[PDB]
Design a protein around this ligand. Structure first.
Ligand SMILES: O=P(O)(O)OC[C@H]1O[C@H](O)[C@H](O)[C@@H](O)[C@@H]1O
Ligand SMILES: O=P(O)(O)OC[C@H]1O[C@H](O)[C@H](O)[C@@H](O)[C@@H]1O
Lengths: 915, 911
């Protein structure tokens, strides 16, 4: 309430200084009018907003939309600092609290909590899902605005530093305001990778050694007189950027080669900085004999020649500084590692050998562990637990490639390739065969040692990309890659085909093949698919007791309902874990969940809690998708929270699991799921005029204009634009549609079922968490806004259909609140609700702004009354506005497209979610 | 006794955990007896302390001497943090804002007069590798970390987990410094002492200059100036002697100078690259000039749409609607060539990359940056241009393409050596035997002549070769990497003219300005005459173009005469030289060669600037920052901000609000005691032959070279100033600093009893006389004749201690009259804390004083029997064998060196 009024004060001053007082008063007037809608429910205020926002000059319209976008963004920044400040004060969920509670209350011993941590691993998978509506220029400014705002509220600073810190804050807000918010060109898969990797640099790299040090501090406070072994990778980091090519033909085999090399050069660069700092630190002389002989071998083998362009340690290092002798050799091999990567990237050859550089992580760890052992054996274990222990943990966590790259392609793309092989040879048509026929042939071919892939094989452009990707996988080192994920996996022949196409393409060390069950049917037959794979002798010899399976929270919610998909994913996880335990396999589940509730999003410790008991056991992978990367790792503060949340919630779920559902609960969920999906699909799939309404009532067709990603009826739509359209209108149709029908069906089947619905919400964590998130969504909902879009853009014949959907909204919210114990939305949580009451008037302004602009774009002859210009800069019509001409040759009249894009970015900013 | 007790309580714990409890309380028992010597004066206890320091095992003697050294170091770190925390509280020694307010309101200058003064001010801080830094760079690195942990451990809002983790880091780095070899086993190269000095330019000075200029701008705002200080105003410059001063150092070769010049140019390129690609991300605005628009479209068109796959950011071509990124992207690639071209010249001697591909001048670099600045301003975005862009522009004007400008220094006789070889080989005669008037007319005829002089047939020694080869290297390297050519022990205008000719006859196509360094008393007395002779010859006036720079040495003048007479002639030299310069219309810039110790002209920066005569600075001054002082003034960020502010504020106040000139009575008295003080000084150091034998007996002067501080490898005038001061500082006697002052004061009182009130009047009113005496009492605070009397009783011969006690009593005498002139009850009355910093350190200093004298005894006296006692350290002799071939028996050299570093740490000064 004070951080917010501070930054908004600075912005409105910058606005008045640059464009005059009229543009400032207008923006403030919009807030007051919208504040009366939000505060009273006066639907006539929306017509008042519509009146003002129509008729503006093209430049003023862009400036109005951009100002509100920046103020909503500033409001977000003001809240991120406020919660950080409150979390700090609350310490004057935690990993030390979780360790204490796990020893004192649930009664586990410190040693079995120690043993649990040493076997835990949470892999966080960065993906470039097109959800980051803010360009990196603007995000970079947000870091400095938050940094200024934090230092500005220390009780330590002088009046003069206070005066300079605000001047820097005002100039950073101005720098963002005068930047083109609209990304005028589509990004490159290499650009998306760099955006993800930037968080590995600025936050994650030094983040996880600081977090691993806290884990040791927590272990010491529960009696463990021992550090967590540095080979324990509590957190690992993977990437989809450059590897996932599902429906992205711009992700080429060249692109994957690029990101693998560029990441290896980045890793060498960060290792260089750490080794140079370590060279200066370890100036001791006492060392083990094994290092004493190694330091004398290196000092003798290398001639006493100088390197005049080295800034430190440019002469031969004396042997009485053994740790510098050993690390100087590591530093020299690292420089070769960096530029050998540099050369391969520029032109795929290098003068620098592989023997002169680091090729394996054992090669890199060997001298570093020698220094650690050496220091310990002289009683210098305290010195070895400093920067050296940090680095040793960084190598086990990041390796030579910084992150491991998953590869993802869809199943029918492999079937296309194998059918080509069988058709080109004499065998027949792999596409026409039954599923069991395919499993029979693939196993006869994997067992047979005769090659299959013919050199003269005719290839489409799609078949060439699939094979070329596998060729790229064979060229680059195996430690640069994670698994090969099958999008749209349905049956074991999908997994076996990739296993064969891998070997038939020269992958000497094949990646693990992970199926991604994304739709409802695929998830229903998922434990059956896993079982028959586990019953094949060849496949069990290949996986060696380790299996990974991915579940897709996005496309499954889009196929069925939210409630149905949520339930089926619970069962798929549960029955697959049972299949794997019967067959003696350690299953690792890969949760592909996005930022929004509709795509599997929600607080980390709550999403882990809703997962079936005894299906994690210290081995889990989760996708951090697009804008979520900023949400979790945009600043050191946040990275420490994100690392602590995943580590604590994964450890607690292991030793202290949640409850399994009662048999009556399961039966109710199974029947409610059927009713939910039928109700969902009756509106989304069966209703003929749905997509016509859906394209009228939402800004779906404009999502691509934001230029977020590299990807060049409802069946064809992606999940992110799907959720996006219904989050922009604050309707959130896919997130709740069906839950109303399932709840009614349950209580009209039996009135007592209302009492078991209340028992499930109070006792079943999966149920509480699922329905708690639905409440949080209805908090961010407003049927009045959906009604405004219906009125301005939806044809009259479809208006009764829209009102039907708003009726299902109101009855679903009525229910869910009554199954919960609450009077109204968000009782026992007022801070988030306070953050809503302050952001909402500016979102409502943009909602009215977006709707009326869409009307001006679709109806080119919608009459408006021109208003006098508001900005002093573009007030005189001599020559056109630079702001308007930033989009030359637009498909829409001047200013409308830019105005529309800014409302989409601003609503996403206020909603704190894009899709 | 807060941070102090903290820092040692951990060290004492780390010591016991590694070496056992007996060694722990042995060093505490050493504090026991010495603390009671300081709290009594019992000379009995020093012999008692010496009794058990003697018999220690060789490995234990090293550990004890090192343990005291690390605790005295920790006591200094705790003092540094306490001071910084106290200064922080005093804002919740003048601020730059307070100085601007005082100059406007009290003194009554207009804010525009203050503004116009600041725009014309330049304080050049000259980093030198003078051999004063006793600590290894590895140890200095850990001292910064220990101060960092100790600071964060006292924050107002840190958790208990954050506190205990910062504690573990504090201990593991107290232990990492303890288990490091404190002794530099090999003598450093000149290219290494360049590294040491340039490390501070990286870690605090680079970002500190634009931060301080930022505070100068807010100060200007709060006195009514609604304008930023122009970015082309170089309020603070930085020069270097490292790799440039070669006087007395034959290891500073012409190749060494070439190295540090190109290496600095590479470091400059590295820092600019980081700032540029950082600025690349920041300047994302689209509004720009007409001139920037045309520029951005010119380069976007002329640049093919190639990509650079190894660029982390901006790896594709940049769109022309991001104009600032287009220009800065070209700047970035031109800087990458500049860095690599310097790398190639440094490794080999040639580069594939052209000069046309890189930045060869400040103007070439500034043109794109100033275009962006004017562009942002013309679009109403001045507030953006004043962010990172202004900081970088200020960094260019402050540091340039070489980061620091190098100064070259060689002594006058080395130049006369070469010129004598020329005339002898040509048959002109002997330049060495000509009178100075003849020398002037000959060189002036050769400078006016067009015929070459230096024959390639010239027979050369190694020294005459070093002089010419150094001039050759000056001709090869770019002019913007050099400052002035400085002449050590300059005496007369021919020394200046000799260098002027040698420069031109060695092919220096744009000659360096020649600066005389007047280091000895006789040279300073004739210095206004030498400057007037140079200002009166038409050739030299046409060359210098109304600007002259003269260096005055504080180290060698205090060694020639006394401290009183040096400081007074230095006052008169500056005073009369400025009067000569004003008569001839020349702007004179004084270069003050000040050291760390008071004996070599050291002291608080704002106090030293106040001591200088009025109307001698006027916004143009250069000051040396020598060796260990570089750490004192720039070791951490708040120290750099403090140093820049003192120099800026003191210099600015001196110009518009000068000190008072001395009264005629004050001058005459000052002149008369200068004669009496010098006569008293020369009578004990020059006259009396046994002074040398006493000196080398009672001080550890003969082992100062064993610390391997610098790269510098007979009689008494042959000793250099730093070992001279270092010797009397370790014995806590400080003879050179106060010698002639005692005879001077009594002479004034006995000549006339009324002079006693005149001495008091000068102390109350005259800033020069007040600062000079105030620095003396601080020296006496760190002085103790008992320790000097110790060293005598063990090491000096019986015939000489009558002489030693005579000096000991003129110490006590001068201390008496100095306190009576100051009107102070005791030493350091109103400075309570930094006197309580003495009461904590001095027990430890006294144990090492006894350790030094007794160790020196067993070295010079191989006969002195000592009874070995059982070892203390549970580790034991690997620690001994870090010194393989020592001239002395096992452990005594290492113990003697650890001693020297310890006292240097406790005294907070080396030489
Ligand atoms: O040896 P120290 O004084 O601790 O300095 C540490 C290092 O500093 C620089 O890098 C020098 O070039 C090295 O030769 C030296 O070893
Ligand atoms: O354009 P933004 O999203 O602000 O990203 C800023 C820049 O990021 C990377 O450096 C890309 O290579 C550039 O093409 C992009 O301009």
């Amino acid at each position: 309430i004070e951080y917010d009024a501070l930054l908004v004060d600075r912005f409105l001053n910058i606005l008045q200084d640059l464009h005059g007082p009229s543009l400032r008063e207008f923006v403030q007037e919009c807030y007051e009018v919208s504040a009366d809608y939000e505060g009273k429910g006066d639907t006539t205020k929306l017509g008042e907003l519509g009146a003002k926002l129509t008729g503006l000059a093209p430049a003023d319209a862009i400036l109005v939309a951009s100002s509100i976008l920046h103020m909503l963004n500033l409001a977000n920044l003001a809240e991120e600092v406020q919660i950080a400040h409150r979390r700090r004060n609350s310490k004057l969920s935690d990993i030390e609290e979780t360790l204490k509670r796990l020893v004192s209350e649930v009664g586990k011993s410190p040693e079995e909590v120690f043993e649990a941590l040493k076997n835990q691993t949470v892999d966080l998978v960065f993906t470039a899902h097109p959800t980051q509506s803010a360009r990196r220029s603007l995000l970079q400014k947000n870091a400095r605005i938050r940094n200024c705002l934090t230092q500005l509220n220390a009780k330590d600073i002088t009046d003069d530093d206070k005066q300079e810190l605000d001047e820097a804050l005002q100039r950073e807000i101005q720098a963002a305001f005068r930047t083109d918010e609209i990304r005028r060109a589509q990004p490159t898969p290499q650009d998306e990778m760099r955006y993800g990797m930037s968080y590995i640099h600025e936050t994650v790299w030094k983040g996880v050694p600081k977090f691993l040090r806290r884990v040791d501090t927590a272990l010491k406070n529960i009696g463990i007189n021992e550090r967590l072994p540095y080979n324990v990778s509590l957190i690992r980091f993977s990437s989809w950027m450059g590897g996932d090519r599902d429906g992205n033909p711009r992700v080429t085999p060249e692109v994957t080669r690029d990101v693998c090399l560029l990441a290896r050069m980045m890793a060498a660069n960060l290792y260089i900085d750490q080794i140079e700092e370590l060279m200066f630190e370890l100036s001791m002389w006492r060392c083990n004999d094994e290092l004493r002989v190694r330091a004398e071998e290196l000092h003798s083998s290398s001639g006493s020649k100088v390197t005049k362009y080295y800034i430190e340690f440019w002469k031969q290092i004396p042997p009485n500084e053994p740790y510098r002798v050993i690390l100087g050799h590591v530093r020299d091999k690292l420089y070769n590692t960096r530029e050998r990567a540099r050369h391969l990237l520029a032109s795929g050859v290098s003068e620098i050998s592989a023997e002169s550089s680091f090729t394996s992580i054992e090669e890199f760890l060997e001298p570093l562990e020698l220094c650690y052992k050496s220091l310990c054996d002289c009683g210098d274990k305290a010195i070895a637990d400093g920067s050296l222990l940090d680095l040793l943990r960084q190598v086990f966590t990041f390796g030579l490639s910084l992150v491991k790259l998953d590869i993802r392609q869809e199943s029918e793309r492999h079937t296309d390739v194998i059918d080509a092989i069988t058709t080109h040879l004499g065998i027949g048509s792999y596409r026409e065969w039954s599923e069991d026929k395919r499993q029979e042939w693939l196993l006869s071919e994997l067992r047979g040692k005769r090659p299959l892939l013919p050199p003269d094989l005719p290839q489409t452009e799609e078949i060439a990309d699939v094979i070329g990707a596998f060729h790229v996988l064979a060229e680059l080192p195996p430690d640069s890659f994670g698994p090969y994920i099958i999008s749209m996996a349905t049956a074991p022949s999908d997994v076996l085909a990739v296993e064969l196409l891998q070997r038939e393409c020269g992958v000497r060390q094949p990646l693990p093949v992970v199926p991604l069950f994304e739709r409802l049917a695929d998830l229903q037959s998922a434990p059956a698919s896993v079982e028959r794979l586990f019953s094949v002798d060849w496949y069990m010899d290949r996986i060696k007791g380790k299996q990974q399976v991915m579940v897709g929270y996005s496309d499954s919610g889009k196929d069925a309902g939210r409630l149905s998909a949520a339930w089926q994913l619970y069962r798929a996880q549960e029955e697959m874990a049972q299949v794997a335990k019967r067959y003696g396999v350690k299953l690792t589940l890969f949760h592909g969940r996005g930022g929004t509730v509709g795509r599997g999003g929600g607080p980390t410790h709550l999403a882990i809690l809703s997962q079936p008991p005894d299906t994690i056991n210290g081995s889990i992978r989760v996708t951090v998708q697009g804008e979520v990367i900023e949400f979790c790792f945009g600043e050191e503060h946040l990275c420490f929270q994100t690392l602590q949340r995943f580590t604590a919630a994964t450890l607690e779920h292991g030793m202290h699991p949640p409850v399994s559902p009662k048999p009556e609960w399961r039966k109710l969920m199974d029947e409610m799921a059927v009713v939910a999906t039928e109700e969902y699909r009756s509106v989304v799939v069966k209703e003929a005029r749905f997509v016509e309404y859906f394209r009228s009532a939402t800004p779906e067709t404009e999502y691509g204009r934001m230029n977020i990603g590299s990807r060049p009826g409802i069946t064809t739509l992606r999940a992110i634009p799907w959720i996006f359209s219904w989050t922009q209108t604050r309707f959130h149709l896919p997130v709740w549609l069906g839950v109303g029908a399932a709840f009614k069906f349950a209580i009209d089947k039996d009135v007592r079922n209302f009492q078991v619905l209340k028992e499930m919400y109070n006792e079943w964590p999966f149920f509480r968490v699922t329905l708690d998130l639905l409440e949080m969504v209805f908090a961010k909902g407003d049927p009045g806004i959906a009604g405004l879009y219906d009125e301005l853009l939806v044809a009259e014949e479809l208006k009764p259909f829209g009102k039907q959907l708003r009726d299902k909204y109101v009855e679903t919210q009525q229910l869910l609140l009554q199954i919960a114990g609450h009077k109204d939305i968000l009782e026992g949580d007022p801070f988030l609700k306070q953050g809503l009451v302050l952001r909402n008037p500016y979102i409502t302004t943009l909602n009215v702004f977006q709707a009326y602009t869409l009307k001006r774009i679709r109806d080119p002859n919608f009459k408006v009354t021109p208003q006098p210009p508001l900005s002093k800069e573009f007030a005189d019509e001599n020559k056109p506005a630079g702001l308007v001409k930033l989009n030359p040759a637009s498909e829409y009249p001047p200013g409308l497209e830019d105005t529309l894009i800014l409302t989409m970015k601003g609503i996403a900013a206020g909603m704190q979610n894009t899709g």
